[PDB]
Symmetry: D2
Subunit: 272 residues, 4 copies
Amino acid sequence: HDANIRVAIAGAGGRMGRQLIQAALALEGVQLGAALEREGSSLLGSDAGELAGAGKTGVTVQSSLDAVKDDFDVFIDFTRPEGTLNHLAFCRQHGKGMVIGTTGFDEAGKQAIRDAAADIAIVFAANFSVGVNVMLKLLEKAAKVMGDYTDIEIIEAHHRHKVDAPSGTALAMGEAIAHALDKDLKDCAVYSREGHTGERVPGTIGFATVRAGDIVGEHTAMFADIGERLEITHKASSRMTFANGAVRSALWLSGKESGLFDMRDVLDLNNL
Amino acid sequence: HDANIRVAIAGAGGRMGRQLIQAALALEGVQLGAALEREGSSLLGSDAGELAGAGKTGVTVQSSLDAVKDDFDVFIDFTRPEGTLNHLAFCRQHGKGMVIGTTGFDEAGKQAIRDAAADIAIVFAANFSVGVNVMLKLLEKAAKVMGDYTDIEIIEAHHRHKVDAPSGTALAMGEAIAHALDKDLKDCAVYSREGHTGERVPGTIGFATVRAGDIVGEHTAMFADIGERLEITHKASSRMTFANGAVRSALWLSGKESGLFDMRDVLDLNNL
Amino acid sequence: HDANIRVAIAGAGGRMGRQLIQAALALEGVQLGAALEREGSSLLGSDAGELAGAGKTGVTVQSSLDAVKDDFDVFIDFTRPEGTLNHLAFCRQHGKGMVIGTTGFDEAGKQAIRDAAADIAIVFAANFSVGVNVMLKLLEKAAKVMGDYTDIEIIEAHHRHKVDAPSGTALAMGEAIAHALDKDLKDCAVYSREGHTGERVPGTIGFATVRAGDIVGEHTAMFADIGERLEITHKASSRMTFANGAVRSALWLSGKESGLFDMRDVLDLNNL
Amino acid sequence: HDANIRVAIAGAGGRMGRQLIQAALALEGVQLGAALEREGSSLLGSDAGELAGAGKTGVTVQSSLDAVKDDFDVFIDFTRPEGTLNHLAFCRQHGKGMVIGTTGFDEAGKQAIRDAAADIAIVFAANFSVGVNVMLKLLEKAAKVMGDYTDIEIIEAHHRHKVDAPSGTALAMGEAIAHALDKDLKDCAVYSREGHTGERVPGTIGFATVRAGDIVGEHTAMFADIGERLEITHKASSRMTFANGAVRSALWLSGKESGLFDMRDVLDLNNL
Ligand SMILES: NC(=O)C1=CN([C@@H]2O[C@H](COP(=O)(O)OP(=O)(O)OC[C@H]3O[C@@H](n4cnc5c(N)ncnc54)[C@H](OP(=O)(O)O)[C@@H]3O)[C@@H](O)[C@H]2O)C=CC1
Ligand SMILES: NC(=O)C1=CN([C@@H]2O[C@H](COP(=O)(O)OP(=O)(O)OC[C@H]3O[C@@H](n4cnc5c(N)ncnc54)[C@H](OP(=O)(O)O)[C@@H]3O)[C@@H](O)[C@H]2O)C=CC1
Ligand SMILES: NC(=O)C1=CN([C@@H]2O[C@H](COP(=O)(O)OP(=O)(O)OC[C@H]3O[C@@H](n4cnc5c(N)ncnc54)[C@H](OP(=O)(O)O)[C@@H]3O)[C@@H](O)[C@H]2O)C=CC1
Ligand SMILES: NC(=O)C1=CN([C@@H]2O[C@H](COP(=O)(O)OP(=O)(O)OC[C@H]3O[C@@H](n4cnc5c(N)ncnc54)[C@H](OP(=O)(O)O)[C@@H]3O)[C@@H](O)[C@H]2O)C=CC1
């Protein structure tokens, strides 16, 4: 973009690395600091931010943190925990704020992130979608006013290769609702409906799961009464949803140096 | 309406009787012949077709077939099998064509209907919705062209008091698809998805069931490939869907005296 | 129901009167006080709350406020402004709290309601649906977090006899969003899309209108970004949605004697 | 894939070229013959079908028809008419069957294609989606049985950069319906609904248009009566929908040498 805040994207030729580029490129106030790749890297030294399209962007694919350690303000990581912990110690070193989307840390791993945060400002989250998060927060506002009367159902659709049912986002939805109602999902979820099964039990939260084709991800929570239904649905079209939120956080970091934050923090969901 | 074909509606103050009235009233070419009720009947003798609204319609609620046996052309029954078999023998008698929507006959019951039909023209079906039927027929046209590539899923929503999952209409959908593909539903249906369950198996037909509030009935069959999905959905808002189809059949009977027909017959689904 | 709070429903054989009955009947903590009708009334004196089904309920259709003025706690009115102003002065008189859903008052009319409220606790609103209202409130929470990035679209479907486009609920949605964004609907609404019309202008709020069959009312607001969309949809199935909210308000009145409140008040939407 | 029929994909590094690769790769019975690029081409000589992922595929990006003119059976073109007419004359020459998706020919252009077809088997269509086409064909089957009663509405959603409203696919839908009913779209379409506009006129076909974010393309035709609605919806997720159909046609060509065919031909839509 070119704008007050400067961004490096590690994992440059990766699935998210690509998107994180166009995002960075796109979002006002954030400008593409650096673009890293992995040594063996064929996109190395040059192939300068033209994964995201946009021909030429000025910035160039590197391999060294210190080779560029002054081209960027915030470090954006969607890599592997082993890279993460690398990037981590260098970020801490040079007071570089991070945005971490990498998953799969172990416990040792999280503590590190957590400790680094004493000296550096980090955004670490398991879901960078703004839609999802906003959605999880509206779900409890709706649950407080309707949760009691209504029949609450959760319907999710995913591609044919999704191996667990229901998804985690769905379970997360279930959980927000449940907690809004001072209930426990464990005592009211219903994951299947087959055969003869009496009338629906009040207070239950049932789950319906659709697995087909290439569906990136769709989630709907329904608040159904006699006479009406309220639905809040989230449809993900691409992994650009994750990228966008990472970048927004990157822009939000600008001006922090504190601790450990999440999308709630970025999104001020707590005062919504 | 007042129109070339004349219609009596038994069960006049019943759940369908009411609707069958407005329908009869509404549909061009069909005119409200008579409106029966049950002896004890408080709507008796008068309360003349003003369940359907329309103030006054000329026709009057009776109790006797022979008290009116010449006010109507086709007899419309959505009652109880015990009434049905009554109405039956009088219809046969006076060469009165019937439209039967009543359910729950036993085997003795169907044979009778079937036998009556040697002398009289009857429309007997378990689902009078035109939408449903049309839908079942488009489902096999779509299945023939896409059935092979696609992931076919069936999603149905019903009120909180529906006691079986999936519905019969859903199973019927499954069955049309399956037969279009020379398959057997029994070997490919999947009614639940809970927990860890590997990637979706090709050739399967999964079912997703939603039970909430007052939903009259919603059915969707999805044909999902990489890159796209075709959906065919049927939403029932009221039991007017059944009434409408009964009346249409009543109009179609006009000019038949043959056998036993169904909605396929009425709807010429076979040449669609 | 029989429960701590007691309710009279004027307009007893009217379109809402019927529903307001089943509601009153249904909702815990509210019990069917009285059921009024209009003098000429054929449901008079007896036909005791059996419009809502439930055979017999104990309460009996009357014609006189003072004939029953002590059978009920809160007065529920969905009538005509001319009845309203009647009911009004008697409610004020006997410190009877009201719930008014009647529409079409003139200015003289509202002032009266407003004045009555100095001495009596009234709930007066133009839309008693809880779903709608909750929905209008989630719309501005979503607008504050996403309103800026997203393309916000509003899609509404109504029966074939709806004569204005878009509906008022839709316009209301537009308006909540717009105000959340310190904008003015007037400068960004787009009600039609026909022919050649360049790319969508940022910051706009477009409206899409569907008019078909018997659709009671469906409203969807979409928050669309690159990569995802959040939808909040309200589907009305019956006019039971209005009835339910009226009764809930009736229960909420219990313990008030103050002024003039609305669904916001009943629903504590302000602290949501 | 490697399979009885052999395929060359011109435009190899283009938007469709990429997808046409994975498709070819994916579809049973079709095997990736050759992959062309344009002289200046950096993916030249090698970068062998690894745009579609799949690391290495054996086949290699070339520049010469005769450099490969015996590596493939059917020629797949989604290029520019100027390339098309090139590819054309060489296909004719070596009795190579074509699949053409390129758009924008002029009249001179179509005649050529049409003439080439006297000696060669070509599939030329403006929409290679199977879903769309199947859909257009189910639309007229539904229109014949319901078209008369129902209120038919067409709702389409597209990204924020779509410049005409409604889309061509939508207009095409309108047109199939209209012709099924021996009507003319021109006398019954309704493209906008704004302001005060009386009840919906019977026999009309209204259009509702949604323009937001990155929506690839969604189309729904609704058949709405009192009491129910049938919907047939097509959702495009990617341009893989076009690629898939091109390849299927490529496989269908196998064994033809005749004329000019379209997706109707490939899909046997005429006997469906
Ligand atoms: N938090 C969220 O909202 C979401 C998180 N993700 C997470 O983000 C990460 C990225 O996903 P994705 O893009 O699909 O994965 P990919 O396989 O696409 O790529 C990972 C990238 O990181 C690079 N890389 C891998 N290991 C290391 C390492 N040890 N040191 C340095 N660079 C490394 C890879 O380079 P190379 O292959 O060439 O070595 C590649 O560029 C994953 O952890 C994923 O789970 C994804 C979506 C959402
Ligand atoms: N085929 C289809 O598409 C559908 C069929 N139905 C079927 O149609 C029938 C009607 O349903 P519904 O209207 O809900 O039922 P209801 O309970 O509403 O009423 C049945 C009606 O039949 C009358 N009746 C009952 N028994 C007899 C009898 N022995 N002789 C004469 N009249 C009789 C009743 O009068 P009273 O109570 O006063 O004696 C009442 O008028 C049922 O069999 C139902 O399953 C419903 C929807 C769809
Ligand atoms: N605020 C909201 O959420 C909504 C409000 N409504 C409003 O509520 C009202 C009720 O609607 P609806 O039920 O359809 O209307 P209806 O025509 O169904 O009936 C009105 C009722 O009021 C009675 N009535 C009419 N005029 C008077 C009068 N002057 N004094 C006493 N009783 C009177 C009628 O009796 P009779 O005919 O026998 O004289 C009838 O019982 C309307 O104002 C409507 O706009 C409806 C839905 C929602
Ligand atoms: N029929 C259908 O269902 C659909 C058709 N299309 C049509 O297919 C075509 C492809 O679209 P798309 O992939 O987006 O376009 P692109 O811009 O992505 O690429 C066009 C491709 O053709 C190559 N090319 C362009 N001109 C010529 C030429 N004169 N001779 C040889 N090769 C040529 C380009 O190479 P280079 O840039 O390097 O020269 C590139 O590989 C378009 O006509 C499009 O309208 C797309 C979707 C659907």
